Amino acid sequence: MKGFAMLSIGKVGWIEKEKPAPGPFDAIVRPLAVAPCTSDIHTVFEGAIGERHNMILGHEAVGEVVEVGSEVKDFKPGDRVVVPAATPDWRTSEVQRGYHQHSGGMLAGWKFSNVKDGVFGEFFHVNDADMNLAHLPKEIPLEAAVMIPDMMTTGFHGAELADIELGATVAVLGIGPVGLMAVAGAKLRGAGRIIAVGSRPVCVDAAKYYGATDIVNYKDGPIESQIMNLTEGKGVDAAIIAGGNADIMATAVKIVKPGGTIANVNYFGEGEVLPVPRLEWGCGMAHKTIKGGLCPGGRLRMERLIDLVFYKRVDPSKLVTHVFRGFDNIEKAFMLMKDKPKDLIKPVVILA
Amino acid sequence: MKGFAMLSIGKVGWIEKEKPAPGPFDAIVRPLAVAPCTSDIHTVFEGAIGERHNMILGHEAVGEVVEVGSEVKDFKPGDRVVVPAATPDWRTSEVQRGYHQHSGGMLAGWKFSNVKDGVFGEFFHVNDADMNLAHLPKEIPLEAAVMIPDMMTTGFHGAELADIELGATVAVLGIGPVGLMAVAGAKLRGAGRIIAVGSRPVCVDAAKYYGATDIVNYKDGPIESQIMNLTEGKGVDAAIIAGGNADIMATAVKIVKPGGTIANVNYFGEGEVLPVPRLEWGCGMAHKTIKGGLCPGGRLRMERLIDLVFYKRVDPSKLVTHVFRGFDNIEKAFMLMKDKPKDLIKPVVILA
Amino acid sequence: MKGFAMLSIGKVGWIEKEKPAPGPFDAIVRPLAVAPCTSDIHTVFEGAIGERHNMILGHEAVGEVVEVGSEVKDFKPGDRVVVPAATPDWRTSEVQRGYHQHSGGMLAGWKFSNVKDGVFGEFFHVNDADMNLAHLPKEIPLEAAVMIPDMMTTGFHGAELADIELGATVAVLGIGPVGLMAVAGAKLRGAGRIIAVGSRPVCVDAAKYYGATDIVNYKDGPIESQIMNLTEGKGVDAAIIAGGNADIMATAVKIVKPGGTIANVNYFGEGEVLPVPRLEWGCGMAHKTIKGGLCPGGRLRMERLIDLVFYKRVDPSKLVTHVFRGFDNIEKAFMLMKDKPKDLIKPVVILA
Amino acid sequence: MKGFAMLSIGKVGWIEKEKPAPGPFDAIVRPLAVAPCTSDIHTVFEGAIGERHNMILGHEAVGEVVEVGSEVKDFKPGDRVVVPAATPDWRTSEVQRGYHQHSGGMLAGWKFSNVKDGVFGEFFHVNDADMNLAHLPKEIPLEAAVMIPDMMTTGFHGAELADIELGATVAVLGIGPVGLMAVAGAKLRGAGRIIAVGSRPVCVDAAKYYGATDIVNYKDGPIESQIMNLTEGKGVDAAIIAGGNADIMATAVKIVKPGGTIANVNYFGEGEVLPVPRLEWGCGMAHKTIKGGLCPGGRLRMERLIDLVFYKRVDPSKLVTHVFRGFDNIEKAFMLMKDKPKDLIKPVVILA
Ligand SMILES: NC(=O)c1ccc[n+]([C@@H]2O[C@H](COP(=O)([O-])OP(=O)(O)OC[C@H]3O[C@@H](n4cnc5c(N)ncnc54)[C@H](OP(=O)(O)O)[C@@H]3O)[C@@H](O)[C@H]2O)c1
Ligand SMILES: NC(=O)c1ccc[n+]([C@@H]2O[C@H](COP(=O)([O-])OP(=O)(O)OC[C@H]3O[C@@H](n4cnc5c(N)ncnc54)[C@H](OP(=O)(O)O)[C@@H]3O)[C@@H](O)[C@H]2O)c1
Ligand SMILES: NC(=O)c1ccc[n+]([C@@H]2O[C@H](COP(=O)([O-])OP(=O)(O)OC[C@H]3O[C@@H](n4cnc5c(N)ncnc54)[C@H](OP(=O)(O)O)[C@@H]3O)[C@@H](O)[C@H]2O)c1
Ligand SMILES: NC(=O)c1ccc[n+]([C@@H]2O[C@H](COP(=O)([O-])OP(=O)(O)OC[C@H]3O[C@@H](n4cnc5c(N)ncnc54)[C@H](OP(=O)(O)O)[C@@H]3O)[C@@H](O)[C@H]2O)c1
Ligand SMILES: [K+]
Ligand SMILES: [K+]
Ligand SMILES: [K+]
Ligand SMILES: [K+]
Ligand SMILES: [Zn+2]
Ligand SMILES: [Zn+2]
Ligand SMILES: [Zn+2]
Ligand SMILES: [Zn+2]
């Protein structure tokens, strides 16, 4: 049918398509709430993943099941489901290795608006419904639930990769929606001091809400010097990268103490090389582990985060600053992500 | 000096001993606040660690440094410090393996009221001050800080041993002071649903405060049946044992799902064998990992738990139900632990 | 078709069933070489997993694909394959948790001769062929290859569970075919000293071949005292249980040092409880981790063990002491596992 | 007391100092066998660790204890010992975090020929003898034992950091003495295929001896293309960096599959930045972990590696290509490392 799609490199618009058909194990979902992402901007305007032709955008959606294949057992038409941004193929060798995000190739667990039609349409296709859908409790509002498919699972993954010990000091570089969930994720991993690096006031306020004990604004000086002064030269036990340019990797290495971990969940769109400073990395021997992973998807990941919201461990509704209602307003919410206003964190479009 | 001591098996009383002298790396501390433990009850009236003669009891104390050895660098007379219940020798082979709790032998990190005069005296000896003391911030009151040396580090260790994934369902068997900190620890590891098992109303109330979402009373029926009904037959991702008799190990194995973890921090004082049910343990193949560890000690452990309290990640003051004043009430608080009233969780003696 | 089956508890015999039909993702395999297992003895004559009716026995087989479903992509009729004893359903919640051995329930990844007709028949059914089959290189003979499905993956799993550090001292309690692979697995994890506990000379000879540095005969005296004398009172860093009765769990705990690991891969067929000694387990606080897991299965596991054999890291051929030829000798080889002669390690029936 | 020392940047020569005196916990050792290292060449002629003045060189030594402090308990005059290159202070906060290599600061566990007179003297000082010395069994020759302090512990550390699963494919970039021990280390962790990258025939021969299944010579083409062709486009499960310049980091990321690990133990002496390719690192999301650590030291590490040699798990004598006799030949063996002949791997000077 109609869908907000990438017409060509650098240009987008509504196009004409056929309604997707479900396989024996798949399901067709109609969206109830959707959200745009900064990653979709990188695909369109920077060409970071190559050239696409008439591909629907969007990968964050909470919808209602309308049709299932003959083999779907746990979902029926009428069920209220959370759809993860990553819907991998669960029958490959990379799944047996424990990295479903790369099932079938690097980043191949991320299908929506990458190698597969996204969620910005009246219907979309979800492969392996029993493995890639989670029921949505009535107690969770749509605006909060639509932060789970991507923002919550990415930010929490950064905290998971960070290997946070109880009471450790954690720095979160960047407090966009992913970084704000990284701040909340560190609090969920038992972090004591959480130092957040950001400038936008609407984000700084939300960072304190999610557990940040210190805010480092670049208006006071270089980030490295500020954090080293805050930690009295000790540094941080772990740094979570959730924003910035390639140089932020150098900053993370400089502020993490020997034996610590740099956990990256930032999608670097430009630059050939990510710099690792030789001297500050101990010339290769400082035991500063560097991790960088795509957000996990699938049913279990969604079910675990739904319980965190259900039992009031984290409230993602603070991420939602703008709410829209039309299918035509999907374009408007997208435009907000193109040129970030200072009062926007994450916009949500309620469809039905 | 004076000290409340274990005279023989079944008898305690105040005695007179010589004030301990510090070695070049040691410190002499006078207590500012102390707390009795159920373990000392087991030592005196059950002979759980054998017979002692004129051994000062107690291993939970916040104190003021009065004297240090010539080689102590980070602590001077007058410093208010949190003293860990475990003060191990940091120069053994077990420390290089990462198990300071067993530095020099099984449970050898536990010295106070075991192989060394405890803290229930006008002064006590702390070996290796720079490695086994942590500075106490003025912002933390004495009643809350004296929960850190033993209760918090033990309860949090149960949560650490449990290998909790984000959103996992955790059962805490026993909600005494250690179990209440296991509940708080489970919340500090991103647990979603936390099922606490206990009956005493003062403990049930504190368990809800520290994050318990469900309360299971053993007076209403078998714990296994209740928890399986709550989890709709799925079981729990992890069970933390913090109380009960030897049979509670069988209960933990039965409620943990295949691949889960049983983390024990309960001190079993009676029974020759802890039963592991064959069928419910998968006849040996259910991947139900069983862990059991003594609480971590040392400076770094105390500093990180102090940071957790300082940055308001947990408030252990709700563990304290009775506060008395002065040395003479150490006896009153000790006997309070033997005859457990239904309103007692943890008593504190302020030595101002 | 014909099949050697368990009629009821205590009864075995040849039966007749319908040749299995493959689903779209399944494959029908005819066996080229099979081996009986001690686990089937426990299932039939001890009723360790309950009563079965006309369940064809056997779960260790190398076969030839004769039929595949329409969706099988990597295997065709005529391919010679190694079939893992564990062939789990790869589309479950337990797979997303990382425990395919319990996909769909405790031990539910083990289907052959458990909840599904085994391999001791003219044909057998393999669910999810592309995920549960591995190609057999021509360089590996059938007698050696049939040690991979069960013996090698189980024994190596014991070493994996043991958390062996480079140079650590490992004890292997029991040197049947599984224990001998635990010896080889421990060598493959960088173990230094490997202490093997067994009495049968044919097993003692194979233990030395696979890397055992010391032999402890339990008929020669108490295991604990002998091992404690060998390690000069230190104990072992890890103990792998691969045989014995329920009492061997107490033996393992007594010989492992504080902080070490007890890794069980032994299938306990009798007894209600596996005893854990309270005092030797530190009264619950010795950090002696107890693990017990079913062997991993699936394509990737088989492929990696095949690579270990291909690149000559392990030669499982020395496990095979008896080779017979023909379907009728499946009964003879099965009975050989029942009345264990002193010269038997593992028998193989060639159906070529 | 004489010692071969670094006079200034670019100059070396023999000096005279006063024989060092041990503190109460230290020991004075006279060397029985020493070996020069490439790190000392970089220190003297490239100033890789800054400018030093009149510092005795050398950090690889087997020696005889001649004097101990009053508090040394496990070592007496006359004991033959293996001295780790890293002799950290075991009483710091970084030790309680589990990183003794950085006890007191980044790389602060490395004292010999860094902040302390090295082992190229008639005597040298060992701090904390009971924690930093290991008894040398008479069964291990000096030439083999002197490979343990540095080469073996470094190379094996690369294999440990690599997170090798049983049967995994491992690439070792660089086959100098450290890389050759990384190959042996990969074999110890259960690697199947081991791909070694090198050109010198004496190293290629030793690489096959230690377990390499494939050799990649740059004379046949680019390393990235050769390795991807060998693995049929799959890549390797882990890459161990043990040589080369900063550009080798980019090669490692390119050949490791998503979810794998890059383990670096190479000492990068020049360059401001270590390049990480953005696209081949999944734009930050490929789950390609990068680790880089200094070699472990201390008594326990040495004792476990001694056991590996004692029980014949690894023979490091293949690393020794040149053997000299007498103190005066320390200069000759040192200069041998500066202008490496194609037949040199590691030289050893036998003393006494
Ligand atoms: N791994 C995954 O699965 C995944 C999932 C979702 C998104 N992503 C991508 O990863 C990144 C997450 O960012 P986001 O979604 O939270 O929105 P975002 O607005 O792009 O986050 C960027 C944050 O980093 C700050 N920043 C910019 N330059 C910086 C610099 N040199 N140093 C320090 N901070 C700097 C920004 O500050 P100000 O804006 O206040 O000026 C902002 O706080 C995005 O690129 C996103 O597309 C990845
Ligand atoms: N690992 C360490 O380093 C360490 C440190 C300190 C203490 N410990 C020991 O760990 C244990 C923790 O006890 P505590 O200090 O927290 O005080 P506690 O009051 O003795 O804790 C006992 C808890 O277990 C419950 N309980 C008793 N029987 C039960 C049963 N059949 N089923 C379910 N629950 C049952 C009790 O419920 P109700 O009382 O509400 O009825 C209570 O909640 C103690 O034995 C202590 O000596 C260990
Ligand atoms: N986890 C899994 O997936 C899996 C897979 C396959 C098999 N298994 C099971 O694991 C167990 C391994 O047995 P197996 O197949 O290798 O053949 P097995 O011959 O039955 O192994 C028994 C071993 O234990 C020894 N033993 C008997 N009593 C002992 C005692 N008190 N103390 C110490 N050792 C004692 C035996 O010594 P001697 O015979 O020399 O006297 C023998 O070495 C079996 O029960 C098997 O069913 C499990
Ligand atoms: N982390 C620690 O504690 C520790 C301990 C000891 C040493 N190290 C350092 O780790 C490094 C290991 O070197 P080493 O001691 O084993 O002696 P080495 O001779 O310097 O090892 C260099 C090896 O790497 C090869 N090589 C050179 N350039 C290469 C490239 N672009 N790509 C792949 N291979 C290349 C060399 O072959 P060709 O030159 O013949 O082409 C040679 O085989 C040294 O720098 C050493 O200082 C670190
Ligand atoms: K690290
Ligand atoms: K487990
Ligand atoms: K352990
Ligand atoms: K990884
Ligand atoms: Zn996104
Ligand atoms: Zn206590
Ligand atoms: Zn079997
Ligand atoms: Zn060196």
mmCIF file of N, CA, C and O in Angstrom, chain B residues 97 99 101-102 107 157 258-259 264 268-274 276 278-279 283-287 289-290 292-294, chain C residues 97 99 101-102 106-107 157 258-259 264 268-274 276 278 283-288 290 292-294:
data_model
loop_
_atom_site.group_PDB
_atom_site.id
_atom_site.type_symbol
_atom_site.label_atom_id
_atom_site.label_comp_id
_atom_site.label_asym_id
_atom_site.label_seq_id
_atom_site.Cartn_x
_atom_site.Cartn_y
_atom_site.Cartn_z
ATOM 1 N N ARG B 97 44.008 -15.931 43.480
ATOM 2 C CA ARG B 97 42.931 -16.622 42.774
ATOM 3 C C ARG B 97 41.632 -15.827 42.751
ATOM 4 O O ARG B 97 40.699 -16.218 42.042
ATOM 5 N N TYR B 99 39.770 -14.978 45.672
ATOM 6 C CA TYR B 99 38.882 -15.381 46.759
ATOM 7 C C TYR B 99 39.526 -14.967 48.086
ATOM 8 O O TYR B 99 40.035 -15.798 48.841
ATOM 9 N N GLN B 101 38.028 -14.013 50.681
ATOM 10 C CA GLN B 101 37.257 -14.557 51.795
ATOM 11 C C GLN B 101 37.887 -15.819 52.368
ATOM 12 O O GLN B 101 37.651 -16.148 53.537
ATOM 13 N N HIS B 102 38.688 -16.525 51.575
ATOM 14 C CA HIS B 102 39.328 -17.762 51.994
ATOM 15 C C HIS B 102 40.844 -17.614 52.012
ATOM 16 O O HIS B 102 41.577 -18.587 51.826
ATOM 17 N N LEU B 107 37.075 -19.840 54.752
ATOM 18 C CA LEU B 107 36.445 -18.810 55.579
ATOM 19 C C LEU B 107 37.451 -18.027 56.422
ATOM 20 O O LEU B 107 37.059 -17.313 57.353
ATOM 21 N N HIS B 157 26.092 -9.915 47.992
ATOM 22 C CA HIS B 157 26.860 -11.014 47.422
ATOM 23 C C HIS B 157 25.942 -12.110 46.905
ATOM 24 O O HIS B 157 26.223 -12.726 45.873
ATOM 25 N N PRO B 258 15.576 -24.708 34.643
ATOM 26 C CA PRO B 258 16.817 -25.248 34.073
ATOM 27 C C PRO B 258 17.697 -24.135 33.523
ATOM 28 O O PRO B 258 17.225 -23.226 32.837
ATOM 29 N N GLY B 259 18.986 -24.206 33.842
ATOM 30 C CA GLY B 259 19.918 -23.173 33.457
ATOM 31 C C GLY B 259 20.051 -22.041 34.449
ATOM 32 O O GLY B 259 20.920 -21.179 34.268
ATOM 33 N N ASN B 264 23.657 -19.194 47.456
ATOM 34 C CA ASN B 264 23.467 -19.313 48.893
ATOM 35 C C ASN B 264 24.417 -18.396 49.647
ATOM 36 O O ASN B 264 25.621 -18.382 49.376
ATOM 37 N N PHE B 268 24.538 -22.294 57.277
ATOM 38 C CA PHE B 268 23.905 -23.502 57.798
ATOM 39 C C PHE B 268 24.689 -23.982 59.014
ATOM 40 O O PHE B 268 25.850 -24.389 58.895
ATOM 41 N N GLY B 269 24.055 -23.943 60.182
ATOM 42 C CA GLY B 269 24.731 -24.273 61.420
ATOM 43 C C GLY B 269 24.528 -25.704 61.862
ATOM 44 O O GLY B 269 25.295 -26.226 62.676
ATOM 45 N N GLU B 270 23.495 -26.349 61.329
ATOM 46 C CA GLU B 270 23.114 -27.691 61.736
ATOM 47 C C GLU B 270 22.878 -28.562 60.508
ATOM 48 O O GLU B 270 22.582 -28.072 59.413
ATOM 49 N N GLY B 271 23.009 -29.873 60.710
ATOM 50 C CA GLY B 271 22.839 -30.829 59.633
ATOM 51 C C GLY B 271 24.157 -31.306 59.051
ATOM 52 O O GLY B 271 25.093 -30.515 58.899
ATOM 53 N N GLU B 272 24.255 -32.596 58.722
ATOM 54 C CA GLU B 272 25.495 -33.090 58.135
ATOM 55 C C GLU B 272 25.554 -32.848 56.629
ATOM 56 O O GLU B 272 26.636 -32.584 56.092
ATOM 57 N N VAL B 273 24.417 -32.914 55.939
ATOM 58 C CA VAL B 273 24.365 -32.829 54.484
ATOM 59 C C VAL B 273 23.303 -31.816 54.085
ATOM 60 O O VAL B 273 22.259 -31.704 54.737
ATOM 61 N N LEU B 274 23.586 -31.059 53.025
ATOM 62 C CA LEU B 274 22.590 -30.204 52.402
ATOM 63 C C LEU B 274 21.990 -30.939 51.216
ATOM 64 O O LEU B 274 22.716 -31.240 50.256
ATOM 65 N N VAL B 276 20.371 -32.036 47.796
ATOM 66 C CA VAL B 276 20.096 -31.596 46.434
ATOM 67 C C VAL B 276 19.202 -32.656 45.793
ATOM 68 O O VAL B 276 19.644 -33.797 45.592
ATOM 69 N N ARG B 278 17.610 -35.145 43.394
ATOM 70 C CA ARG B 278 18.148 -35.690 42.151
ATOM 71 C C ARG B 278 17.250 -35.362 40.965
ATOM 72 O O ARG B 278 17.707 -34.785 39.971
ATOM 73 N N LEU B 279 15.963 -35.708 41.055
ATOM 74 C CA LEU B 279 15.066 -35.525 39.916
ATOM 75 C C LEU B 279 14.930 -34.051 39.550
ATOM 76 O O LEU B 279 15.008 -33.684 38.372
ATOM 77 N N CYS B 283 18.567 -34.970 37.420
ATOM 78 C CA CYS B 283 19.405 -36.150 37.648
ATOM 79 C C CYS B 283 20.885 -35.810 37.490
ATOM 80 O O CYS B 283 21.699 -36.669 37.142
ATOM 81 N N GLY B 284 21.228 -34.551 37.754
ATOM 82 C CA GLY B 284 22.578 -34.050 37.610
ATOM 83 C C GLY B 284 22.853 -33.241 36.361
ATOM 84 O O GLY B 284 24.000 -32.826 36.159
ATOM 85 N N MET B 285 21.834 -32.961 35.538
ATOM 86 C CA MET B 285 22.054 -32.393 34.212
ATOM 87 C C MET B 285 21.130 -31.217 33.910
ATOM 88 O O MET B 285 20.943 -30.879 32.738
ATOM 89 N N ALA B 286 20.566 -30.574 34.931
ATOM 90 C CA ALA B 286 19.608 -29.495 34.726
ATOM 91 C C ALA B 286 20.258 -28.129 34.559
ATOM 92 O O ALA B 286 19.537 -27.132 34.438
ATOM 93 N N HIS B 287 21.589 -28.056 34.557
ATOM 94 C CA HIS B 287 22.303 -26.781 34.488
ATOM 95 C C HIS B 287 21.844 -25.833 35.589
ATOM 96 O O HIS B 287 21.831 -24.614 35.415
ATOM 97 N N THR B 289 23.039 -24.259 38.501
ATOM 98 C CA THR B 289 24.282 -23.979 39.206
ATOM 99 C C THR B 289 23.987 -23.628 40.657
ATOM 100 O O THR B 289 23.084 -22.838 40.943
ATOM 101 N N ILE B 290 24.759 -24.203 41.574
ATOM 102 C CA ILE B 290 24.617 -23.943 43.000
ATOM 103 C C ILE B 290 25.875 -23.229 43.470
ATOM 104 O O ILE B 290 26.980 -23.778 43.382
ATOM 105 N N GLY B 292 27.653 -20.877 46.754
ATOM 106 C CA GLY B 292 27.555 -20.529 48.155
ATOM 107 C C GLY B 292 28.822 -19.860 48.632
ATOM 108 O O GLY B 292 29.881 -20.491 48.631
ATOM 109 N N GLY B 293 28.746 -18.597 49.028
ATOM 110 C CA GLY B 293 29.946 -17.835 49.317
ATOM 111 C C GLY B 293 29.819 -16.992 50.567
ATOM 112 O O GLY B 293 28.750 -16.472 50.893
ATOM 113 N N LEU B 294 30.944 -16.859 51.265
ATOM 114 C CA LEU B 294 31.057 -15.914 52.366
ATOM 115 C C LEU B 294 31.077 -14.490 51.824
ATOM 116 O O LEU B 294 31.503 -14.240 50.694
ATOM 117 N N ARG C 97 17.578 -18.147 26.103
ATOM 118 C CA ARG C 97 18.339 -18.007 27.342
ATOM 119 C C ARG C 97 19.727 -18.627 27.256
ATOM 120 O O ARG C 97 20.528 -18.438 28.177
ATOM 121 N N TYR C 99 20.374 -22.104 26.753
ATOM 122 C CA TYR C 99 20.394 -23.476 27.267
ATOM 123 C C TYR C 99 19.530 -24.332 26.342
ATOM 124 O O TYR C 99 18.397 -24.690 26.672
ATOM 125 N N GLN C 101 19.967 -27.373 25.628
ATOM 126 C CA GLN C 101 19.768 -28.700 26.204
ATOM 127 C C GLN C 101 18.424 -28.834 26.903
ATOM 128 O O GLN C 101 17.923 -29.954 27.056
ATOM 129 N N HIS C 102 17.833 -27.722 27.339
ATOM 130 C CA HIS C 102 16.551 -27.729 28.027
ATOM 131 C C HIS C 102 15.490 -26.995 27.218
ATOM 132 O O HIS C 102 14.542 -26.441 27.776
ATOM 133 N N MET C 106 13.017 -29.343 31.082
ATOM 134 C CA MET C 106 14.257 -29.900 31.606
ATOM 135 C C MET C 106 14.652 -31.143 30.820
ATOM 136 O O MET C 106 13.861 -32.080 30.676
ATOM 137 N N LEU C 107 15.878 -31.133 30.298
ATOM 138 C CA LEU C 107 16.456 -32.203 29.490
ATOM 139 C C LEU C 107 15.715 -32.418 28.173
ATOM 140 O O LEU C 107 15.942 -33.432 27.500
ATOM 141 N N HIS C 157 32.104 -31.123 27.922
ATOM 142 C CA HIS C 157 31.241 -30.202 28.649
ATOM 143 C C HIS C 157 31.603 -30.160 30.125
ATOM 144 O O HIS C 157 31.535 -29.099 30.754
ATOM 145 N N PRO C 258 38.602 -24.204 48.349
ATOM 146 C CA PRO C 258 37.648 -23.088 48.386
ATOM 147 C C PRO C 258 37.788 -22.211 47.151
ATOM 148 O O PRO C 258 38.896 -21.865 46.737
ATOM 149 N N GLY C 259 36.650 -21.861 46.555
ATOM 150 C CA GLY C 259 36.641 -21.096 45.331
ATOM 151 C C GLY C 259 36.685 -21.916 44.060
ATOM 152 O O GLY C 259 36.525 -21.348 42.972
ATOM 153 N N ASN C 264 29.604 -31.489 37.239
ATOM 154 C CA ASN C 264 28.997 -32.805 37.109
ATOM 155 C C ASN C 264 28.417 -32.986 35.715
ATOM 156 O O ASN C 264 27.689 -32.118 35.221
ATOM 157 N N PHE C 268 22.913 -39.431 37.391
ATOM 158 C CA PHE C 268 22.563 -40.187 38.589
ATOM 159 C C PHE C 268 21.222 -40.882 38.386
ATOM 160 O O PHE C 268 20.192 -40.221 38.210
ATOM 161 N N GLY C 269 21.232 -42.212 38.414
ATOM 162 C CA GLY C 269 20.037 -42.978 38.122
ATOM 163 C C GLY C 269 19.224 -43.387 39.335
ATOM 164 O O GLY C 269 18.036 -43.700 39.207
ATOM 165 N N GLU C 270 19.844 -43.399 40.514
ATOM 166 C CA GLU C 270 19.183 -43.846 41.732
ATOM 167 C C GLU C 270 19.445 -42.867 42.868
ATOM 168 O O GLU C 270 20.411 -42.101 42.847
ATOM 169 N N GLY C 271 18.563 -42.904 43.866
ATOM 170 C CA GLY C 271 18.688 -42.023 45.010
ATOM 171 C C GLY C 271 17.778 -40.817 44.930
ATOM 172 O O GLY C 271 17.590 -40.247 43.852
ATOM 173 N N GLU C 272 17.197 -40.417 46.062
ATOM 174 C CA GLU C 272 16.320 -39.252 46.056
ATOM 175 C C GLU C 272 17.096 -37.943 46.149
ATOM 176 O O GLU C 272 16.680 -36.943 45.554
ATOM 177 N N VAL C 273 18.219 -37.927 46.866
ATOM 178 C CA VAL C 273 18.972 -36.707 47.136
ATOM 179 C C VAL C 273 20.444 -36.943 46.826
ATOM 180 O O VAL C 273 20.974 -38.035 47.062
ATOM 181 N N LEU C 274 21.099 -35.919 46.274
ATOM 182 C CA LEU C 274 22.547 -35.921 46.131
ATOM 183 C C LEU C 274 23.148 -35.155 47.297
ATOM 184 O O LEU C 274 22.911 -33.943 47.413
ATOM 185 N N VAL C 276 25.358 -32.946 49.723
ATOM 186 C CA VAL C 276 26.415 -31.945 49.760
ATOM 187 C C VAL C 276 26.841 -31.790 51.220
ATOM 188 O O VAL C 276 26.037 -31.344 52.052
ATOM 189 N N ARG C 278 27.868 -30.380 54.600
ATOM 190 C CA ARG C 278 27.749 -29.008 55.086
ATOM 191 C C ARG C 278 29.108 -28.423 55.448
ATOM 192 O O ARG C 278 29.477 -27.344 54.970
ATOM 193 N N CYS C 283 29.910 -24.687 55.266
ATOM 194 C CA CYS C 283 28.598 -24.408 55.851
ATOM 195 C C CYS C 283 27.759 -23.517 54.937
ATOM 196 O O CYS C 283 26.905 -22.757 55.402
ATOM 197 N N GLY C 284 28.005 -23.608 53.630
ATOM 198 C CA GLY C 284 27.317 -22.806 52.642
ATOM 199 C C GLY C 284 28.090 -21.617 52.111
ATOM 200 O O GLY C 284 27.535 -20.847 51.319
ATOM 201 N N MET C 285 29.358 -21.447 52.502
ATOM 202 C CA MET C 285 30.067 -20.212 52.186
ATOM 203 C C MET C 285 31.484 -20.444 51.670
ATOM 204 O O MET C 285 32.304 -19.519 51.718
ATOM 205 N N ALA C 286 31.795 -21.636 51.170
ATOM 206 C CA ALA C 286 33.145 -21.960 50.732
ATOM 207 C C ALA C 286 33.420 -21.564 49.288
ATOM 208 O O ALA C 286 34.511 -21.852 48.785
ATOM 209 N N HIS C 287 32.459 -20.931 48.612
ATOM 210 C CA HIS C 287 32.587 -20.580 47.195
ATOM 211 C C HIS C 287 32.927 -21.796 46.345
ATOM 212 O O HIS C 287 33.614 -21.690 45.327
ATOM 213 N N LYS C 288 32.453 -22.969 46.749
ATOM 214 C CA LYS C 288 32.645 -24.172 45.946
ATOM 215 C C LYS C 288 31.431 -24.305 45.036
ATOM 216 O O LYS C 288 30.384 -24.818 45.440
ATOM 217 N N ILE C 290 28.922 -25.621 42.336
ATOM 218 C CA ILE C 290 28.489 -26.928 41.868
ATOM 219 C C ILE C 290 27.682 -26.722 40.597
ATOM 220 O O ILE C 290 26.657 -26.029 40.606
ATOM 221 N N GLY C 292 26.014 -28.796 37.058
ATOM 222 C CA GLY C 292 25.627 -30.075 36.504
ATOM 223 C C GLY C 292 24.793 -29.889 35.259
ATOM 224 O O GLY C 292 23.680 -29.369 35.348
ATOM 225 N N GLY C 293 25.292 -30.308 34.103
ATOM 226 C CA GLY C 293 24.634 -29.988 32.850
ATOM 227 C C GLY C 293 24.578 -31.160 31.895
ATOM 228 O O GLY C 293 25.487 -31.991 31.835
ATOM 229 N N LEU C 294 23.487 -31.205 31.132
ATOM 230 C CA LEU C 294 23.363 -32.131 30.017
ATOM 231 C C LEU C 294 24.292 -31.704 28.889
ATOM 232 O O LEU C 294 24.577 -30.517 28.707
#
